Amino acid sequence: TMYESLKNYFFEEIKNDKLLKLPDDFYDDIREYIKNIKDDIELERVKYYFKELRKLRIYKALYLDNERENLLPEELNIIHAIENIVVELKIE
Amino acid sequence: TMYESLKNYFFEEIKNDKLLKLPDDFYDDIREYIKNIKDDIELERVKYYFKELRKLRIYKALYLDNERENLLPEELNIIHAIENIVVELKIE
Amino acid sequence: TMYESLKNYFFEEIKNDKLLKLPDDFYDDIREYIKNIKDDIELERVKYYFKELRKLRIYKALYLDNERENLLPEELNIIHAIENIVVELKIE
Amino acid sequence: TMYESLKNYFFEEIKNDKLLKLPDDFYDDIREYIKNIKDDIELERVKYYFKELRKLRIYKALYLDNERENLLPEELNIIHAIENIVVELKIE
C-alpha cells in the first residue's frame, strides 16, 4: 500500500514543472512505516521510489522552481547545504 | 584570483559527462579564503560559482555518473541524505 | 557589547538548576553579528562564551533538566544526535 | 549479547578519567545489529546503554579530556557542533 502511494506521488511530480505540495511529515510517515515493515519485498520498492521522488524534487528546486514554499524543511536543508557557503570558526 | 579559479572548475565540469576529480579540501580552501576576504565584490562572485559548480556536480552524481570516486566526502554526504532512508529510533 | 551580553547569559545559566529560556534566534543573532565584526579582539571573546554557554546547556539537558521546552531547536538536534540511534538504510 | 557488550564499554568508560579508545565503526556496528534485531526486549536495553555511553563520552570531551584522539569522527562532529560558531553565507 505504501509502495503504490509513493509511485503516485512520483508520477504526479514528474508531470508538472513546479514543485508539488507534500503533506507535512510526508517523509517522517515513510520512516515510521519502515519500522513497521517486516517484508524485504515492499522495503526495496519503498526505498526505490523514496530515492527517485527526492532526486527529482531536488532537481526541480535546483534548476526549475525558484519558489520553495512547497519544499519541506528537510528538503530546503539539503538545498541550502548544496548552495550556501558554510564556514566554521575555531579558536585555533 | 579565486573568482577566476572557480570559473575554470565550473567551465571544466560543464564540459564532461563524468564527475571531475577535485583536490582534497577544495571546498575547505574556499571557506578559508572567505575568512580572508574583505571586498563584497569578489565575495558574491565566489558565492555564485560555488553554488553553480556544486549544483551541477550534484546533478551529475544523481543522474549522470553512477561512479562516485570523484565525489568529495561532503558531496557524498549530500547525495546520501538525498537518496537514503534515515530512521531515528527513540525511547518513547 | 556582544561580549558582555553573552557573559550575562552565561552567568545566569550557571546560577540555576534548570535550562533557561533563550530568545528565539539567540544563536542566529550571534552568527549575524559575527559577519559584522571587524576586530579579532571581541571575536575570540564571543567565540569563548558561545562555547562555554552551549557546553553548559548541553550538560544540563543531558543530566540535570529532563524538561526540554527551553532548548532551542538547534540544541535539541544536538541532544537527539547524542542520545538516539540513527540508522541509514541503503539499496546495497 | 550486544546488551552485555555495551554495558562493559559503559562500565569501563565510567571508571577512567580519560576518553577510552573505541574500535573503528563501534557505533556503525551497533546500527547494523539494530537492523538484525527482532526482539523489543534487547532493543530498549541497547538503546539505553547507547545513550548513556555517548552522554558520558560527550561530557568527558567537553570538560575532562582535552585530548580527542579517542573520539570517533561522529563524536568529534558533535563536539564541534557544540563548541564552534558556524555561519552560513547566503546570496540575499
Curated annotation (Swiss-Prot), chains A, B, C, D:
User: What is the protein named?
Assistant: Uncharacterized protein MJ0248
| Species | Methanocaldococcus jannaschii (strain ATCC 43067 / DSM 2661 / JAL-1 / JCM 10045 / NBRC 100440)
Shown chain mapped onto the complete sequence = 24 to 115 of 194
